[PDB]
Amino acid sequence: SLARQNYHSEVEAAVNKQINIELYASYVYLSMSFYFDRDDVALPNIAKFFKEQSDEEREHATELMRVQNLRGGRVVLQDIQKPENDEWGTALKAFEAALALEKFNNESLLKLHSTAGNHNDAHLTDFIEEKYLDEQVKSINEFARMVANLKRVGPGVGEYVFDKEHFS
């Protein structure tokens, strides 16, 4: 790359790893979406929410692919591992699994941020802070609040009311 400057080989590799983690998260949320779309689950606002989260994670991945090229690194893709489960249980259990995924995503981003800082990559630490770290804290908070509300409403009519009210 004619452009590459202050962009360490270790940071380039760490960006490729993070691209795969974001695509994995996109795939988990796609699975959760179509689980809540099942004819025997049928919580459509939850299903729609997880499809939107799947789309957001795919955009997290593509913006890292864009910055990889911007800095003169090379995008190297890996297999996207299928999610841990085919079925996600109650709304409460699924949102608990989503919270765990968001915290895993955050640990991964903080590791990437650390690697960038270790190599004095002021451009990429700022990029990760501005475009990833604040959104990730807001997402973890959102999922923690939804878990609190799913515990509050309980199973049955509460789950129905949550689906009808929480996303409108």
Next chain:
Amino acid sequence: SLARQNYHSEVEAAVNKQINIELYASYVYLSMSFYFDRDDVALPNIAKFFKEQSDEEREHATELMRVQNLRGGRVVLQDIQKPENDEWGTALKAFEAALALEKFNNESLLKLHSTAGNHNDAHLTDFIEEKYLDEQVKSINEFARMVANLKRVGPGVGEYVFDKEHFS
């Protein structure tokens, strides 16, 4: 003050005391707001309501600071004491505490009104009646009605439904 007329030193002091009581109430409602904003409480319409009540109490304080100057008294501020609790329990318990605060505010305003009347301050008794006493009766009634409804809906899904319906 070139303006001061029929404005008793005792009434001036009582207005300064009431300014501090209104600021204290503002601080209690700010505390209640951010308690309902907690990731493990997560009742956002209740949180928003208490922030609006905090703003209203701060306006109660500043309008008394304005009338203090209007009458040629001197504003003398005191420490704003922190609220009695850091945590406010169930929605029902928090609204019961808010009702008790509103009735305390009302007793304080009626005392101020009495002091003004004892000194034949027709301007300030009218000011307190028009701008404070009617609003305070309406606020106490509002909180009593919300306590009745929080008892009616009960804990769990009822608390969620109250948050989603009561403020829209």
Next chain:
Amino acid sequence: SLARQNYHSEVEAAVNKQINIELYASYVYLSMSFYFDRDDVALPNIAKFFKEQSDEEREHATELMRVQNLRGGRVVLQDIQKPENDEWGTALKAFEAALALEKFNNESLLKLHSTAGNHNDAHLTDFIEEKYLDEQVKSINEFARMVANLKRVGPGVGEYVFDKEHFS
């Protein structure tokens, strides 16, 4: 599923296989997009086109996930295999690879259609015909015409002119 009717296990499995093939095609086009986005390739209308094709293939996958649920089948996801290449060569070679992918997709869809027909699944043969087979013929034709034009314009200024004119 309370809904499932005239929907054979062999057809359900074939729909899950096709979902994976569509997600794979989405991943190939994402790879091609970011290759043409490289600072040493820099053909942005080609890059944008392949991102649009990536989005389209993901929609092909999610519409099969949707019809799986409509028929009372159960979505079962597999790993999304990384593409065969990290780098895709000239515009001509990349569009030739895309054409090969589209013909592979079409063979896969015709196999799924055959399996549906073997089980007298009149709903799913019509669904595949209406929503997949005509779009797939149009996509193969589009790619064949783009290959003809990339051969016509040749390398260098022709590739630049193709990028500037072909997607306007």
Next chain:
Amino acid sequence: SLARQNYHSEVEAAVNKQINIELYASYVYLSMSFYFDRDDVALPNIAKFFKEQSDEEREHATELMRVQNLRGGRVVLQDIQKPENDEWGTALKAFEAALALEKFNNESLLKLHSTAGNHNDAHLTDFIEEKYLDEQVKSINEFARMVANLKRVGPGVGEYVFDKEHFS
């Protein structure tokens, strides 16, 4: 908190300390506002300006209360100390006191930022930089320029002209 991640108890405590400092600054500016509102001071654009600054400092406090909750910390409020003065002297002396308050606020924010950095809290260092440090530099600069202009215009007609022109 189900959300809390990479958020040290020392940083949580430092955020609570800063919340109190912002509320204190809000109270100082409310005092200055009603001083310039006095019937024997009567500089209404200065009074309005300090009320706006009071409102801004309360927003500084509530945004730190919000980020405390976002990170899964727990808001702990303390008494809001009354300002050092009841009366604030000339416009020049009041704006000099305000400048000193702003520099105190800035030292406090840089201490909080240092504590966050010591614990590798990349989210909170970015939050403080983006939402606090640039605004604080601009506020100190604004107050320094207003002090320069209040020295330039001098007492009497200059103070009147400053009030009429500086906030238009």
Next chain:
Amino acid sequence: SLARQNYHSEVEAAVNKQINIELYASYVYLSMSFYFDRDDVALPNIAKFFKEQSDEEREHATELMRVQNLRGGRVVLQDIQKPENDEWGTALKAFEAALALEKFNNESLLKLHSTAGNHNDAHLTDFIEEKYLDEQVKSINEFARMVANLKRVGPGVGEYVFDKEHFS
């Protein structure tokens, strides 16, 4: 300065150095603009682009002059050195020279950023990150992509087509 706080003399000097580098870059792009405006070169969209880049570099300089004043440093200007060349050769050669200038500007900014960080200047590291480092990475990438396209189109009709298409 009544405002100056956490602003080291070494950082103040480094900001004055960067102001001169930005003005130098503005002058180089003004030279390149009027070279492409020559009656025997006559590539007017390239000329207009370099005039826009000259204007942008002057804005880079004036925003550093502004932050120098915001922090209570003192602007000290130096001679603006004339560019290395009076004539810039082919479009390809001129865009290669511009890419080298942008990478020089970036190394200079990263040095300024390092100096600020060495003095724990959280305000100025964030200012440089937010307003300089991402724009500088995007500019280097833009110039690298234009060099790739000028190699692709070749001399003669390709240069003409690039001028007519690349800036539209």
Next chain:
Amino acid sequence: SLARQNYHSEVEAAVNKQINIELYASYVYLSMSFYFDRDDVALPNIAKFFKEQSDEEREHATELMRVQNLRGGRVVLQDIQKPENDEWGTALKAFEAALALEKFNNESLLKLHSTAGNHNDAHLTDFIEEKYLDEQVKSINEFARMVANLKRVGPGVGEYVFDKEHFS
């Protein structure tokens, strides 16, 4: 140049000299602008005015670069010398220095005009008359009138009133 006609080498050289003088004037006004932007000077309408004057002088330079190319001459740039001062004293002293600069610019333009006339360059004498000599007379008149008004208003409140009123 295929275009060059009735364009003497002495006139071409004199245009290059005038381009440098205009860029020098631009740099002086940029210095004066950021001097009035200082936190201890803080006359923002004067600062804005000098920034506009800096922009105008840069346009004077670029229009001479344009006419150099129109006549088939060749732009040759020289170093832009830093201004005589880092600090410009009172508003009155700065405007007196600006007036001296404008009269210097005018003497320089009349010398260029004389050189053009000596070589019977009817095109360039008309160009200098139409685009430079009348605006230069109006600029000198503007600065003389501002000096008269800065003497009238005197130091202190007068300087503040001039800043607030003269550019509105």
Next chain:
Amino acid sequence: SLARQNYHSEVEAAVNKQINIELYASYVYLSMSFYFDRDDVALPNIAKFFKEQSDEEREHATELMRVQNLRGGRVVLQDIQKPENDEWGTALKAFEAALALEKFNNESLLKLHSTAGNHNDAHLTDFIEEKYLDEQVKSINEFARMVANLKRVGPGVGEYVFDKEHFS
């Protein structure tokens, strides 16, 4: 003429000569236009451009007829000589011929201007400067740039691309 004042017979004659030269140039461009309109040449944007240039030269002639009458001179017309060529070769050859015509027109205008100046005709020297000399310098520059671009693009596809792009 009751109007004639400071208008020498030599200047009147020189204006009649220049009217004929402008009409001649109009006829040359009409010829070039219909040459590019030929069924075996077929460059329609070049054809349209030369028709516009023919119209402009006729306007140059009629404005000199108008000023002849304004000054109380008498218009005396001569034969309009047919152009030097019936056919104008390549686009490059035609634009080189046009450039030579424009420089001839300019020599003629400067000789007219000299004659006017020799008779102290301040009105007519100003008229020629304002309405003829700057337009003529801009026209020569335009033709020189078009010759540079026609050399750049070369014969064949380049000539086609020039016709399609240069006049839109």
